[PDB]
Nucleic acid binder design. Structure first.
Length: 150
DNA sequence: GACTAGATCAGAAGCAGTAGAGCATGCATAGTTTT
């Protein structure tokens, strides 16, 4: 949906943005949410989030992890911490339709292994790590973002 | 996931052939009238 009147995810989150924010760019991941369990349907069997069938009870959820512009302010060159803080003041999350990915501060390896073990326990792919001072470099790989899997 | 292509079956329309009905033409004969 390109307008609040008609869409599959936008008609519900039109009014989820604080009044001050008028121009806003966000980056995130789109996934499928099962409400009867209140759990995210892991990608794979029984559904594709690209061409979901209307009759299905599953719905679309947007998990945000970055902001690149708010009220004609260019946040590309700022540090990750600042972008996170500004992101916290964009929308009031409304579970099931738009959310912010939680990030935990960690400064030891035991924490990383604990997180990976817990992720495997919750049947997730893995865990990723972000450098607090990393800048957004479009199209580049392995600059401030790292991923870890079993 | 959305979309299309090819195979399959049935339904319906067109055409062929037959049977049944109706309408002209003749004439065969008898009946009636005239001389």
């Amino acid at each position: 949906g390109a307008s609040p009147t008609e869409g599959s995810l936008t008609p519900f989150i039109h009014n989820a943005f604080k009044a001050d924010i008028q121009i806003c760019i966000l980056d995130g991941e789109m996934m499928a949410y099962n409400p009867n369990t209140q759990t995210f349907m892991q990608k794979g069997t029984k559904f594709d989030i690209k061409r979901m069938v209307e009759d299905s009870d599953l719905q679309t959820c947007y998990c945000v992890f970055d902001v690149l512009m708010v009220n004609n302010k260019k946040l590309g060159h700022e540090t990750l911490r600042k972008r996170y803080e500004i992101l916290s003041s964009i929308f009031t999350p409304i579970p099931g339709r738009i959310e912010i990915v939680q990030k935990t501060q960690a400064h030891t390896k035991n924490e990383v292994i604990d997180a990976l073990n817990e992720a495997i326990d919750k049947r997730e792919e893995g865990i990723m790590v972000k450098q607090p001072l990393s800048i957004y470099k479009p199209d580049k790989r392995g600059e401030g973002w790292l991923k870890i899997k079993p």
